[PDB]
C-alpha cells in the first residue's frame, strides 16, 4: 500500500533496490527482494513477514532486533499505540505469614510488528526480550495465540 507515510524514505537498510536492470528482462516488478531473518528458539517466521511490504526496524523478523533473554507471555490489553501494544501479565504472589497468595499483575508495553495482522484484545502473545526499543518497551511480540472464545 502506502509504505512511504513518514517524511523520510522507508526501506530495509540491507536491501539495495537501485540495481540497474534492462527493461526487456522484467518479470513482475524490477527488483525488490525482502529482507527477513529467522529468529531462534524455534519460532516460525510469519508468512506476512516474508511476503509483506511494511517497513519496521523494530520487527523481530524483518528489522534490526535480536531476541535474547527472557521469553514471556501475556494477554493483549490495549492496542491504542502505533506498532505497540500493552499486555497484562497476571501472577500469584505468595505471602508466607498467611500461607496464601494474592493476585498481582504487571502491564508491559511490547512492540507489535505489522506482520501480526488481526491481533485482538485478550489473546495470548509470546514476547521475547530485546534491547530497549523506547522508554518503556523492551519486548517484541514473537507469537500470537488467539483467545479461546474467538471464532
Amino acid at each position: 500500500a502506502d509504505i512511504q507515510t513518514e517524511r523520510a524514505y522507508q526501506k530495509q537498510p540491507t536491501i539495495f533496490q537501485n540495481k540497474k536492470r534492462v527493461l526487456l528482462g522484467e518479470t513482475g516488478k524490477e527488483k525488490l527482494p525482502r529482507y527477513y531473518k529467522n529468529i531462534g528458539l524455534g519460532f516460525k517466521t510469519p508468512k506476512e513477514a516474508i511476503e509483506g511490504t511494511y517497513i519496521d526496524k523494530k520487527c523481530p523478523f524483518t528489522g534490526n532486533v535480536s531476541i535474547r533473554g527472557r521469553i514471556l507471555s501475556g494477554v493483549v490489553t490495549k492496542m491504542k499505540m502505533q506498532r505497540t501494544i500493552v499486555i497484562r501479565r497476571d501472577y500469584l504472589h505468595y505471602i508466607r505469614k498467611y500461607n496464601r497468595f494474592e493476585k498481582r499483575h504487571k502491564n508491559m508495553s511490547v512492540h507489535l510488528s505489522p506482520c501480526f495482522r488481526d491481533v485482538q484484545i485478550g489473546d495470548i502473545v509470546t514476547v521475547g526480550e530485546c534491547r530497549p526499543l523506547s522508554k518503556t518497551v523492551r519486548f517484541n511480540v514473537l507469537k500470537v495465540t488467539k483467545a479461546a472464545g474467538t471464532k
Partner: protein
C-alpha cells in the same frame, strides 16, 4: 467469619494492617504523636534545671506531701514535675541546679499516690541521689 481462601492473602494482610491501628500500644508507638508529646523525646533520661520545689498531695485514700521539683529540661525547655524519691532527699536539691531525671517506671504514666507525676530525680549536681542519701558522696560546693 474470616475468609479462608488460597488467594485471600491481600485481604488478610490489609485487615491486619488496618486493625493493628485499633491497638492502643501499637498506635501509640507508630503514630508519632506520643513521641512529639513525650517531654524526654524518646530518651530514657534527661537533664534539667530545678525551677522550684513543690509538694504534691497524695491521692485521696492516702495522706502525704510528696516532695517533687519543677525542673525545665535543657534539651527542649519543657517544664516537668519530678519526684524526689527518698526522705530528706529534697534537702539535697537546691533551686536552680542541674538534675538528671528518669521515668517513674510506668512508661509515661503516673505511679501510685503522686498524681500527674511521671518523672523522678536520679542525680543532682552530677552526683546520684543514692550516694547522697547513704552519705557516700556530698554536694559539691
Amino acid at each position: 467469619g474470616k475468609c479462608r481462601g488460597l488467594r485471600t492473602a491481600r485481604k488478610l494482610r490489609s485487615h491486619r494492617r488496618d486493625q493493628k491501628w485499633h491497638d492502643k500500644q501499637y498506635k501509640k508507638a507508630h503514630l508519632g504523636t506520643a513521641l512529639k508529646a513525650n517531654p524526654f523525646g524518646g530518651a530514657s533520661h534527661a537533664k534539667g534545671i530545678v525551677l522550684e520545689k513543690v509538694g504534691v498531695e497524695a491521692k485521696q485514700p492516702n495522706s502525704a506531701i510528696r516532695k517533687c521539683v519543677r525542673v525545665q529540661l535543657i534539651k527542649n525547655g519543657k517544664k516537668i514535675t519530678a519526684f524526689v524519691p527518698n526522705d530528706g532527699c529534697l534537702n539535697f536539691i537546691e533551686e536552680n541546679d542541674e538534675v538528671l531525671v528518669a521515668g517513674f517506671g510506668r512508661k509515661g504514666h503516673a505511679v501510685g499516690d503522686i498524681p500527674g507525676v511521671r518523672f523522678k530525680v536520679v542525680k543532682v549536681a552530677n552526683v546520684s541521689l543514692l550516694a547522697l542519701y547513704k552519705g557516700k558522696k556530698e554536694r559539691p560546693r
